[PDB]
Design a protein around this ligand. Structure first.
Ligand SMILES: N#CC1CN(S(=O)(=O)N2Cc3ccc(Cl)cc3[C@H](C(=O)Nc3cncc4ccccc34)C2)C1
Ligand SMILES: N#CC1CN(S(=O)(=O)N2Cc3ccc(Cl)cc3[C@H](C(=O)Nc3cncc4ccccc34)C2)C1
Ligand SMILES: [Cl-]
Ligand SMILES: [Cl-]
Lengths: 298, 305
């Protein structure tokens, strides 16, 4: 029993974190084999012009108490790839994957190449993340672990004026319409991840919280008309299919659970809580609910 | 900016997790140097749990009855002893991944990270608090026994909790790493229930100071309160009494924000009376009590917004 915002164990990622310094800027880098990946704003804009003025020895890379020697450099989108002479002996099995809004991942927050904390978060529909980052956190990475393979999906680049965060995949492509420069940038109006709220309602049922269940059902179209009114993302047939296993385990049809959600949106919780929360939680995917209510190990 | 329930990076603890099997029971163990620590109930057979005589069950065991697996490698047990509710298995290999560590016993209100494991393999990491009733609101399934709680201040891992059991309300009970249980609990299947839980007042205050640091003051008021008047009100909402020690501990956060502890107490008193009226504080519609004053200082900026 119990339901917590759980992150993947961060060990395999901790062994990849390094400090990257260029001039007066210090941030975090990800050392995999003989390459260190970090945000290109460490050279700071005309990034080709700023980069051509740099030599290998201008980049100081520190792994623990050991200096790594930079022997090459190149830029890929908004990521700087620093070739080093030493391959990371702690390099785990890994992939670079680009995630979609609604997907969750673990963030290992680092400062000066040293990990300070791990937390779980979701890629919002507006492509920002509600993270916890201070100055110096740039280069901190997001990941998921499947068996023994680490799938790196996020690299932290910046904080927006509302306190939320923006970054790239590990190939340097931004999530969202953001740019790596000090210009007028703002997060778009966010929405609630509907398929995730439904997954969390199924987790509440699995843990014994059933007060919100009702005898009613709904069509997908009627549910989507109500979802649009409350700034909830549209629920698709793919979402209904993905929720299939949780529907079978609890005996509550997806559209039957949609009718419970509709009543919660139209009437509130009325002094009650669900899994110790007075808000409808949307940062647990259907897979996160299955994994936490089954004890999958890595 | 931002405020999340943040756990410590679990790497140093992952390298210590092993699987311990005795007969038909399999659970997790903590391998530090040449000793594996695990709950002593690994030697019980379910029926034993009603009234187990651990000394009697243990005397019938030899070293080779305990199977310890570290990854894909079997460790050889060369000695065993019981210390309170923990079994200490001496092994022939010292853990080369043993971090710098201490065993610390914590007080209610203190927070820690939990590395939840099954079959000696870590599955997830989350942040917890020792409730005032000595239970923890964890997320544990069958096979999680032996999972540990810890803090990593600086480069030293301080182990403070080992998971032993789930109570009928879904909450969890366990011991420090010397095998002493937190709370009036026993490692026996007896009628045992968690006492009435209360809200950790000093932690809610710390979290209100974190909200002010991050730029929110809507909940503040022009009033102050005495410590005694605050406690008379707080006790009516099932909040733990606030002591002079708590007021002293909140000193640094009071100086950083310019808001006296008893002025923050007056704000809390009003929040308990009025609720939030559609508003949130740090993305929460409830008053959060699982961040200590230390956690707020650790995570938040030194400059107030
Ligand atoms: N809005 C807003 C804030 C962030 N700015 S800034 O001027 O410090 N800033 C401009 C900038 C522009 C482009 C890029 Cl790619 C990076 C960056 C940097 C960046 O955002 N860093 C950070 C990242 N995360 C958490 C931070 C917390 C606190 C301060 C910086 C933080 C620096 C004011
Ligand atoms: N209440 C209640 C539940 C737990 N029981 S039990 O019979 O499985 N159980 C009695 C028992 C008694 C004393 C001691 Cl020390 C250990 C234990 C064990 C224990 O609690 N295991 C677990 C531990 N954690 C999370 C669990 C989740 C799900 C099932 C077991 C879980 C076994 C029913
Ligand atoms: Cl010791
Ligand atoms: Cl303590």
């Amino acid at each position: 029993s119990g339901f917590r915002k759980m992150a993947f164990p961060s060990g395999k990622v901790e062994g990849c974190m390094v400090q990257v310094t260029c001039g007066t800027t210090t941030l975090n880098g990800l050392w995999l084999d003989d390459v260190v990946y970090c945000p290109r704003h460490v050279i700071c804009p005309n990034y080709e012009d700023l980069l051509i003025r740099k030599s290998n020895h201008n980049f100081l890379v520190q792994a623990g108490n050991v200096q790594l020697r930079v022997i090459g450099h190149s830029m890929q989108n908004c990521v700087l790839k620093l070739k080093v002479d030493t391959a990371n002996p702690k390099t785990p099995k890994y992939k670079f994957v680009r995630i979609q809004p609604g997907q969750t991942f673990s963030v290992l927050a680092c400062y000066n190449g040293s990990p300070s904390g791990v937390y779980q978060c979701a890629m919002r529909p507006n492509f920002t993340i509600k993270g916890s980052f201070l100055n110096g956190s740039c280069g901190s990475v997001g990941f998921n672990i499947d068996y023994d393979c680490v799938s790196f999906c996020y690299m932290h680049h910046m904080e927006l004026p509302t306190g939320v965060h923006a970054g790239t995949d590990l190939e340097g492509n931004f999530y969202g319409p953001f740019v790596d420069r000090q210009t007028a940038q703002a997060a778009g109006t966010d929405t609630t991840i509907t398929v995730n709220v439904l997954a969390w309602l199924y987790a509440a049922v699995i843990n014994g919280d059933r007060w919100f269940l009702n005898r009613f059902t709904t069509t997908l179209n009627d549910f989507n008309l109500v979802a649009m009114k409350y700034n909830y993302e549209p629920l698709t047939q793919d979402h209904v299919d993905i929720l299939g296993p949780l529907s079978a385990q609890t005996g509550i049809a997806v559209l039957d659970m949609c009718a419970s959600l509709k009543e919660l949106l139209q009437n509130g919780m009325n002094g009650r809580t669900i899994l110790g929360s007075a808000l409808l939680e949307d940062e647990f995917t259907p897979f996160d609910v299955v994994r936490q209510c089954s004890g999958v190990t890595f």
